[PDB]
């Protein structure tokens, strides 16, 4: 897609969250599994609907360029940042402004993604550069685009 | 010095070391054979996977994919009734001579619906679905080329083909057990029982399944090629006409037998245990109504077979009619609608004939009358499932692959000549297959290429100059004579390449043909000696005006109508090569999938893997040229789950807790592989020849060496599973606001 080649590089990591099998393809169930995982609800009209516009192959399935077209729309420069504070607030569950090892844990099991809770400590001692033990924008941010 | 595969006169391959390296050959020792050596080309002795035990799916999760590590890969999963294996997209199918117990099953068929190459053990099924789900959403036409030996077991996979794609995806309604009781109603009048084979095919066969713009059925169409017309006369010892006499003269009642004059086999001269003849002409009869033959019909067919029965009967003596021979006359002109007379008349005039051109004339009726009937019941079976229009088939190709025989007459020649055909479509396709796999995957530049055999081709068909062409002239002309024939190919393709003469042979058997009476033909599989006695009078179909006229003439409506589509002269060669050229205009416009089946052994025996002659079919089905080509680049393929299950135990547990692909990706960044050699593919690793099996030496290193690569990436590793989690967020909430912005 016209997006950064480092943009499709993280992007194409993210798709593998949903093509568990890989596989190389996901169908409406992996889209509607992984956006409840992240505390979004559609509904199968939505996800069949949405799926409609990248699929002129018809067998209900989609691979990375075309899930990389279907994320794709008429955007403003302010709505791309918004989207990134929404992203940090998936993990800010209490909106405190920092993510916590247990705000992780949440997050990271929701996606089954397999850790222990030494490993969640660790990832937030990484991410954490002031050293206070939990992660800000800032710091989610810097390690986005790591 | 690890230990290779090296030649084995029985086995194929065998277990050995290299105890000496020469500039040609190499010098091996057999396994717990001190002291014993043989010697190999270079060429023939090859790598071998270190675990003796392992079995894998698709071989080309070898460390080393060669013809070698192949025998021994399906010879392991032969002997655990594991029959389907893959290369790649191609299914190699062993004959297990015994019904293996749940796979044939509709429950297995339900299984296999919907599911990839790979998701599901390798089976004939899940080449059948791909040609399904590959023609519905490409919206292309499929074929299913099924290849090998007599015996192999192309007739019972291109019928479990037919299974499959009418239990899943057919109408519920009679046209799907229309589909499926077509070719056992052609195995009554078109196979035999052979000495390879107790249910031999004894003609080729192209059998298509046609749907609609919604990949419904419609129905279906088949294609038959070289009826074997010497078998309705003469067949070896040990050997049988077709089934439908036989099933005839078991099952037929009281009335029919009567009306008929049926007798047991033994009491027909063109007639020759395990073989249910009875219970088979009970199944023909329901195969018969099913696809809609009504009793007038039935009736009208075992009339001709009868017919051609008695006919066989007729002797004669220095000529004129034997009087033992006086009922048979009778009997076959009744059944034919012909004059008693008229018929004696034709089997000995001109004008007058000796016993054995009167045998000759008999025998010319026979065939050409048994062979009508063989394409009216071919063309009766059409019109059971017929339609007007369709958008799209899967068809099913079932023919006669190269063979072995002490004497090549016209019958292989034909054989042969199809198989180079083939062969040529199917060294394009895997090619083809080949070229995709590198573009999709990001292997780079292919430079992978096979040696074309449009030389071979153009010798036998090409107009004017080639063999086809020759050898209808030499039947044209006043006195044709088979060395006539013979010298003017040896003049005409002197220079050619793929053509040699007897005399040049390093067997004396070959030698001893005269130049005049065979040629060498060198075939994709190897140089064949035809002998090209009798190949003037095999290349002529065409019966005798006065034999013609006769059942032209007949009474009966039936007979008449067999012939109601006809120098006396028709080209079989050449009619073989327009029907040829036909089928291949449609598998050209085709994707195409292969099976390769194979005879497991010559004794018709379960648990009995004959390495050499496996070895030798594997040869001669184009399997080594496709490994030749896959070898150019990258043979070895696992993808990432297959990866982390083999090598998860050689790692910290902190990496067996990722995922399959982020575990490979983290592997990589630590070994520090090279992009050259290992290609981290869409969802498989992709290796270079040699290169999976370094990787796995690596893996199977010094444990603490490998944790410290591990630990050298820690920081890398825990920012990649941050930001998988983060742009997964980012997605989620990018695909929640292209909800909104829909509405
Ligand atoms: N998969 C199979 N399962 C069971 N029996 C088989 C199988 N394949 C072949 N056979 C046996 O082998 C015989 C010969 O196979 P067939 O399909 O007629 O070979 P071909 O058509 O290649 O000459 C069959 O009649 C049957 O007895
Ligand atoms: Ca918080
Ligand atoms: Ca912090
Ligand atoms: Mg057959």
Redesign the interface.
Same mark, same amino acid.
């Given at each position: 897609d016209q997006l950064t080649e480092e943009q499709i590089a993280?992007?194409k990591?993210?798709?593998?969250?949903?093509d568990?099998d890989?596989?190389?393809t996901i169908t409406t169930k992996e &889209?509607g599994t992984?956006?409840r995982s &992240?505390?979004?609800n559609?509904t199968e009209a939505?996800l069949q609907? $949405?799926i409609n516009?990248v699929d002129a192959?018809?067998?209900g399935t989609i691979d990375f360029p075309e899930?990389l077209t $279907?994320?794709?729309?008429?955007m403003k420069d302010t709505?791309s940042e918004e989207?990134?504070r929404?992203?940090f607030r998936?993990?800010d569950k209490d909106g405190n402004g920092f993510i916590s090892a247990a705000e992780l844990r949440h997050?990271?099991t929701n &996606?089954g993604?397999?850790?222990?809770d030494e490993?969640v400590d660790? $990832?937030i001692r990484?991410?954490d550069i002031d050293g206070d033990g939990q992660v800000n924008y800032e710091e989610?941010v810097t390690?986005?685009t790591? | 010095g690890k230990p290779v595969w090296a030649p084995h006169p029985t086995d194929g391959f065998q277990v050995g070391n290299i105890v000496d390296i020469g500039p040609d050959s190499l010098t091996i020792e057999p396994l717990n054979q001190k002291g014993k050596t043989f010697l190999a080309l270079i060429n023939q002795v090859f790598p071998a996977e270190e675990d003796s035990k392992k079995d894998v799916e698709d071989n080309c999760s070898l460390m080393y994919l060669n013809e070698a590590t192949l025998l021994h890969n399906i010879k392991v999963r032969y002997s655990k009734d594991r029959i389907y294996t893959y290369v790649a997209n191609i299914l190699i199918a062993v004959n297990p001579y015994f019904d293996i117990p749940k796979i044939y099953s509709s429950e297995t068929i339900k299984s296999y619906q919907g599911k990839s190459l790979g998701t599901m053990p390798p089976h004939v099924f899940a080449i059948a679905d791909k040609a399904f789900?590959d023609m519905?959403?490409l919206k292309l036409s499929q074929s299913i080329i099924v290849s090998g030996e007599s015996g192999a077991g192309k007739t019972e996979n291109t019928k479990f083909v037919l299974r499959y794609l009418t239990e899943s995806y057919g109408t519920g309604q009679d046209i799907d057990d229309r589909i499926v009781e077509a070719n056992p109603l052609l195995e009554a009048f078109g196979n035999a029982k052979t000495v390879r084979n107790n249910n031999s095919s004894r003609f080729g066969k192209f059998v298509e399944i046609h749907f609609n713009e919604k990949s419904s059925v419609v129905g279906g169409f088949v294609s038959h090629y070289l009826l074997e017309k010497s078998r309705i006369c003469v067949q070896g010892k040990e050997e049988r006409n077709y089934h439908i006499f036989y099933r005839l003269c078991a099952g037929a009642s009281e009335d029919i037998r009567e009306r008929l004059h049926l007798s047991s086999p033994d009491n027909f001269r063109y007639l020759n245990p395990l073989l249910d003849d009875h219970g088979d002409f009970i199944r023909m009869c329901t195969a018969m109504k099913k696809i809609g033959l009504d009793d007038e019909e039935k009736l009208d067919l075992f009339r001709v077979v009868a017919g051609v029965l008695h006919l066989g009967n007729i002797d004669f003596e220095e000529c004129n009619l034997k009087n033992k021979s006086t009922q048979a006359l009778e009997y076959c002109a009744e059944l034919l609608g012909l004059d008693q007379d008229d018929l004696r008349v034709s089997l000995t005039t001109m004008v007058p004939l000796k016993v054995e051109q009167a045998n000759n004339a008999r025998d010319a009726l026979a065939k050409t009358v048994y062979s009508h009937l063989f394409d009216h019941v071919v063309n009766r079976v059409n019109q059971c499932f017929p339609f007007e229009t369709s958008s799209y088939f899967i068809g099913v190709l079932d023919i006669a692959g190269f063979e072995y025989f002490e004497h090549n007459s016209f019958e292989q020649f034909c054989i042969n000549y199809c198989n180079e055909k083939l062969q040529q479509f199917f060294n394009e396709r895997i090619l083809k297959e080949e070229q995709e796999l590198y573009q999709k995957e990001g292997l780079g530049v292919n430079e992978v290429h096979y040696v074309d055999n449009q030389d071979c081709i153009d010798l036998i068909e090409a107009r004017l100059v080639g063999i086809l062409d020759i050898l209808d002239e030499e039947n044209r002309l006043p006195q044709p004579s088979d060395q006539h024939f013979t010298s003017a190919v040896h003049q005409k393709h002197k220079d050619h390449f793929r053509l040699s003469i007897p005399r040049k042979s390093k067997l004396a058997i070959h030698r001893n043909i005269r130049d005049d009476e065979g040629f060498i033909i060198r075939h994709f599989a190897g140089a064949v000696c035809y002998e090209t006695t009798q190949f003037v009078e095999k290349n002529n179909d065409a019966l005798h005006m006065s034999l013609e006229s006769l059942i032209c003439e007949s009474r009966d409506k039936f007979i008449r109508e067999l012939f109601e589509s006809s120098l006396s002269f028709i080209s079989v060669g050449n009619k073989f090569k327009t029907q040829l050229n036909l089928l291949l205009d449609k598998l050209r416009s085709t994707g195409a999938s292969f099976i390769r089946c194979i005879k497991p052994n010559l004794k018709m025996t379960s648990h009995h893997f004959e390495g050499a002659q496996i070895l030798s079919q594997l040869q001669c089905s184009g399997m080594v040229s496709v490994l030749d080509l896959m070898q150019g680049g990258f043979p070895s393929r696992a993808s990432?789950?297959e990866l982390y299950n083999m090598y998860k135990k050689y790692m910290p547990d902190?990496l067996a807790?990722?995922?399959?692909?982020?575990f490979c990706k983290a592997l990589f960044k630590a070994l520090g592989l090279n992009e050259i050699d290992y290609k981290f593919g869409?969802?498989k690793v992709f290796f270079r020849p040699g290169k999976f099996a370094e990787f796995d030496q690596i893996m199977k290193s010094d444990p603490d060496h490998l944790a410290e690569l591990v630990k050298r990436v820690n920081?890398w590793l825990?920012?990649?599973?941050?930001?998988?989690?983060?742009?997964?967020?980012?997605?989620?909430?990018?695909?929640?606001?292209?909800?909104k912005?829909?509405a």
């Open positions: 993280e992007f990591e993210a798709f593998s969250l949903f568990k890989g596989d190389g &889209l992984v956006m &992240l505390g979004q559609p939505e609907d $949405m516009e192959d018809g067998n899930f $279907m994320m794709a729309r008429k709505d989207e990134i929404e992203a998936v993990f997050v990271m &996606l993604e397999k850790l222990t490993e660790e $990832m990484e991410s989610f390690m986005m790591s | 789900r519905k959403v990432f789950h902190k807790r990722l995922d399959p692909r982020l869409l969802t920081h825990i920012c990649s599973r941050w930001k998988k989690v983060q742009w997964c967020s980012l997605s989620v909430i990018k695909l929640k606001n292209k909800i912005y829909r």
